[PDB]
Short mmCIF file of C-alpha atoms and ligand atoms in Angstrom, two decimals:
data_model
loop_
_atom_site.label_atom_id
_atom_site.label_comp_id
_atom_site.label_asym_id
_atom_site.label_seq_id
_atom_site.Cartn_x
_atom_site.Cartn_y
_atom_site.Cartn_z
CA UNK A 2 11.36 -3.78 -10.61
CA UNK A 3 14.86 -5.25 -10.03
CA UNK A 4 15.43 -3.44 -6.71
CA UNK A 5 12.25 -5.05 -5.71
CA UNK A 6 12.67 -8.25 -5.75
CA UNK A 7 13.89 -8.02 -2.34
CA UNK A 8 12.60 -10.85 0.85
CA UNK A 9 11.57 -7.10 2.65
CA UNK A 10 9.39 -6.78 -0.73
CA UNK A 11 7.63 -10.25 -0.38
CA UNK A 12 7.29 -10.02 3.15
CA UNK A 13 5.46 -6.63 2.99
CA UNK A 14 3.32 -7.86 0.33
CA UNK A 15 2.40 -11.40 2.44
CA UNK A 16 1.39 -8.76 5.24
CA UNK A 17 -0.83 -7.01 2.73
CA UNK A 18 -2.35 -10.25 1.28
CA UNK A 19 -3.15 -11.90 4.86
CA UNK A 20 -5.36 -8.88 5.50
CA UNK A 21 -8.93 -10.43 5.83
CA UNK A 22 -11.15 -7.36 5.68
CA UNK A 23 -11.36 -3.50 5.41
CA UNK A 24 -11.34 -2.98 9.09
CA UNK A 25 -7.93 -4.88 8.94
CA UNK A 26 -7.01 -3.21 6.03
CA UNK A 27 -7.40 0.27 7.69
CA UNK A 28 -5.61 -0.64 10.97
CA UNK A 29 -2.84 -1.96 8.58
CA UNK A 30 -2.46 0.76 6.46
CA UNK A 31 -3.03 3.30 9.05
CA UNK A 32 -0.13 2.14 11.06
CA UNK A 33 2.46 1.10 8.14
CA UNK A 34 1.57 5.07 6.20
CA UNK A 35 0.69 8.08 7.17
CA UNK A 36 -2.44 9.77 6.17
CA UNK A 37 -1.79 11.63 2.94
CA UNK A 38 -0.04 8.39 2.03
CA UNK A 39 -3.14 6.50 1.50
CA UNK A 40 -5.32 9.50 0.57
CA UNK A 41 -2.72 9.75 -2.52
CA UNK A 42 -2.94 6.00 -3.34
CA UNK A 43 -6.91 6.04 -3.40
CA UNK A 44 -6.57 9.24 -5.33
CA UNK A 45 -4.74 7.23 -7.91
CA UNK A 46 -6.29 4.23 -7.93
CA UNK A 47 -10.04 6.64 -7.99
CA UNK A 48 -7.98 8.63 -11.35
CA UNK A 49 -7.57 5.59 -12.90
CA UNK A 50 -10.96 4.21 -12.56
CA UNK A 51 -12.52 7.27 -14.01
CA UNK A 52 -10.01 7.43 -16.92
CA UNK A 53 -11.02 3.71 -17.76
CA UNK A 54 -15.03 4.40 -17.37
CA UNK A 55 -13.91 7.25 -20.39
CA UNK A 56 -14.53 10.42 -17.93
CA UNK A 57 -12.20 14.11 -19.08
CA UNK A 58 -9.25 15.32 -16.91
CA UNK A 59 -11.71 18.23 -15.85
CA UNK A 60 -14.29 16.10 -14.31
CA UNK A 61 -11.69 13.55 -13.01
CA UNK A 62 -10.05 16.58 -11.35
CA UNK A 63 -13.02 18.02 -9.75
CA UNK A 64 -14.02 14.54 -8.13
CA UNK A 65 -10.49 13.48 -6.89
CA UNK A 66 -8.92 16.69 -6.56
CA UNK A 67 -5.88 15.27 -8.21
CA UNK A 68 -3.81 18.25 -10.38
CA UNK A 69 -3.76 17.33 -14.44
CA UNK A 70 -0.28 16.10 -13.66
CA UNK A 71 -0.79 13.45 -11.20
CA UNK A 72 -4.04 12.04 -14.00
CA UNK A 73 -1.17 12.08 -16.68
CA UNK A 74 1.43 9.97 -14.49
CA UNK A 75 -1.60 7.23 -13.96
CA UNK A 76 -1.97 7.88 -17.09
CA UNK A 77 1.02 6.38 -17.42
CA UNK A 78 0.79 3.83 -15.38
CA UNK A 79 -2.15 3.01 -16.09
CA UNK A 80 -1.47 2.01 -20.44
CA UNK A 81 1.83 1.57 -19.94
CA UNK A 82 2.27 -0.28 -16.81
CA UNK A 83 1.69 -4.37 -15.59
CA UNK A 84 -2.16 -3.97 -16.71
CA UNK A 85 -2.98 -4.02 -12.78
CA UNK A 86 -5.23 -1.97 -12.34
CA UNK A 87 -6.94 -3.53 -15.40
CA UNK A 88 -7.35 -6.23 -13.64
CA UNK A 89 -9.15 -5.62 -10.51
CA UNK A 90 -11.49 -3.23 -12.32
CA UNK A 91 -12.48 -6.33 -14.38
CA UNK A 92 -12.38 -8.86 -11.01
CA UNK A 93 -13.97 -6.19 -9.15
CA UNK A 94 -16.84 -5.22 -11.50
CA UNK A 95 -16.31 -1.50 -11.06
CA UNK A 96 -16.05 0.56 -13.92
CA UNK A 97 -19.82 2.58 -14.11
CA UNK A 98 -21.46 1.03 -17.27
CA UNK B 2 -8.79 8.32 10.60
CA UNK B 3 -11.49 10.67 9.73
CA UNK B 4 -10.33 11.44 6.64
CA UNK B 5 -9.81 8.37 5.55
CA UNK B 6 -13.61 7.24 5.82
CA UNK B 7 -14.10 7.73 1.90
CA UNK B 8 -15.48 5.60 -0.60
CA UNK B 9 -12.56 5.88 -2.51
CA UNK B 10 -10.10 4.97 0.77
CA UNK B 11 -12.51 1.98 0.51
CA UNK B 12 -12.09 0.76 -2.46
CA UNK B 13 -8.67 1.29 -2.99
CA UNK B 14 -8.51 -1.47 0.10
CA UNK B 15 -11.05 -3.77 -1.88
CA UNK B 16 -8.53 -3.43 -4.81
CA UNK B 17 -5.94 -4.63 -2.32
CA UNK B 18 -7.60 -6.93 -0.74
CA UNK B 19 -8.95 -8.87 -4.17
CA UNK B 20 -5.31 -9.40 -4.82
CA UNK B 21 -4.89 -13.35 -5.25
CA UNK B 22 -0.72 -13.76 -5.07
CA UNK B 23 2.40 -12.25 -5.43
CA UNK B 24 2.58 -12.00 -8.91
CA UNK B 25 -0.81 -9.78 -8.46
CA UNK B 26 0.46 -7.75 -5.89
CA UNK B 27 3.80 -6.61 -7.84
CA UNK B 28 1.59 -5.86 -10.95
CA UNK B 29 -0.52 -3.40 -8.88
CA UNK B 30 1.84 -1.82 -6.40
CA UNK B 31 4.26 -1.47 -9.26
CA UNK B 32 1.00 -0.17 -11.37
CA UNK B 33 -0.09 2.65 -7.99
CA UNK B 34 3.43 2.99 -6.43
CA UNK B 35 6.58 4.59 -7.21
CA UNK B 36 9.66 1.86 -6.37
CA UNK B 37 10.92 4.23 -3.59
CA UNK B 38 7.09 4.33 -2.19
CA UNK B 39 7.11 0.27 -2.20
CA UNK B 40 10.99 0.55 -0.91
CA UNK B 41 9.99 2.87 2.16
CA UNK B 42 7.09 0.51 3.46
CA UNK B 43 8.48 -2.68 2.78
CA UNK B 44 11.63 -1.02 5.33
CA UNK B 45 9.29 0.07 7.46
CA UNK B 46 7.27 -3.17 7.58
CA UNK B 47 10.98 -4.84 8.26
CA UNK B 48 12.00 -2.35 10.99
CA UNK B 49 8.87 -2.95 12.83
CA UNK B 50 9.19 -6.68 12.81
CA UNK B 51 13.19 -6.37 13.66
CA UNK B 52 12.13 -3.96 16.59
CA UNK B 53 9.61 -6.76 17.91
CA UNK B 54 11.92 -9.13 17.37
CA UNK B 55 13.89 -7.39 19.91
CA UNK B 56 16.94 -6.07 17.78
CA UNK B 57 19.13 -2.88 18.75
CA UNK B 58 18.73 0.14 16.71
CA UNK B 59 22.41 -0.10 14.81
CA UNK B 60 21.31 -3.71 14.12
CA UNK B 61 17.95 -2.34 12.43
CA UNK B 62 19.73 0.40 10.61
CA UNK B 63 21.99 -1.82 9.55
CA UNK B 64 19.91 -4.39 7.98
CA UNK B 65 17.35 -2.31 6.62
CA UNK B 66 19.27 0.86 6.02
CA UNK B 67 16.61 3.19 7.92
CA UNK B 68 17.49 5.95 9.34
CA UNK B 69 17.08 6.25 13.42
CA UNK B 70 14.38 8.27 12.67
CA UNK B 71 12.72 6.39 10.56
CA UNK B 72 12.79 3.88 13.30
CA UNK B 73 11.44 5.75 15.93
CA UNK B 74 8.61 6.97 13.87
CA UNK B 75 7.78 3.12 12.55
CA UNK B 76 8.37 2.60 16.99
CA UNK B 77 5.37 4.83 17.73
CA UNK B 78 3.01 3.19 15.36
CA UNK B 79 4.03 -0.31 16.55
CA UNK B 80 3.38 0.84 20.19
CA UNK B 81 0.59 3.84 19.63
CA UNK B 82 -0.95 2.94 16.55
CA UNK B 83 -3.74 0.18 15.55
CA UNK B 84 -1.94 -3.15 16.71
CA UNK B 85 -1.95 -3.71 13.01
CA UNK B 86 1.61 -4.75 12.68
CA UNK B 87 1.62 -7.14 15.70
CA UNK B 88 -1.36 -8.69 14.34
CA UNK B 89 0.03 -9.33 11.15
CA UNK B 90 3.31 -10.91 12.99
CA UNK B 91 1.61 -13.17 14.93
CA UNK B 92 -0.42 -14.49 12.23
CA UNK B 93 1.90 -15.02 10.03
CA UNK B 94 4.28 -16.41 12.54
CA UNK B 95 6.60 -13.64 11.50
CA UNK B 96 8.81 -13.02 14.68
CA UNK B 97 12.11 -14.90 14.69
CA UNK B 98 12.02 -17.09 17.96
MG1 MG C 101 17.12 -10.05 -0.12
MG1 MG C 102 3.01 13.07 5.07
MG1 MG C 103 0.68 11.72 -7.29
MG1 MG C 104 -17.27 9.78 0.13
MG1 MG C 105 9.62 8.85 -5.89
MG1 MG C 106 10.02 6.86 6.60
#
């Protein structure tokens, strides 16, 4: 956290947050990260989704393809973290009732 | 590109793009990221605006601590890539004058 709070940091982050769509979004992201890059984030972010709607590490690993290991460390990140990804699953509506 | 036209690419950028503030973004890129991950894109986000802004390679190593291969990389996306950054730099007014 402390080596983050850098004016590189906030300036990356009011890049991300001036992005006004997905087609943005991917010409962003696509240009700032390589491919496996964001396929790993959105593996993550799917990991932790499915751990919140209650799903096992065998059916979270056949949809995402992520190893046991990378569910554990969002597993992590996840209970033990800033509660962020709490929080858009909430804003966002998305955990499958 | 192609691989990137998931539904989970998607909404990891919906989870990006519902981010309100600062505050929100540190919680979740601190929550998906590792600090080096955040580190290399906010220097890459910095080296690309340093190159537009017309700065010498030592300068850009310098001030970001990239390596001159890390600058020519973040150089072919700027010039070859999605006009992402650029787009991003002149909406935010970004480019020191
Ligand atoms: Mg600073
Ligand atoms: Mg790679
Ligand atoms: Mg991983
Ligand atoms: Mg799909
Ligand atoms: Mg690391
Ligand atoms: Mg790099």
């Amino acid at each position: 956290n402390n080596k983050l709070k850098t004016q590189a940091v906030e300036q990356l982050f009011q890049a991300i947050l001036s992005l006004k769509d997905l087609d943005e979004a991917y010409d962003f992201f696509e240009d700032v990260c390589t491919i496996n890059e964001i396929l790993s984030l959105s593996q993550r972010f799917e990991v932790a989704k499915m751990l919140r709607e209650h799903r096992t590490y065998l059916d979270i690993a056949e949809k995402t393809g992520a190893s046991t290991a990378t569910i554990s460390r969002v597993n992590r990140s996840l209970n033990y973290g800033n509660d962020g990804y709490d929080r858009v699953f909430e804003r966002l509506g998305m955990l499958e009732k």
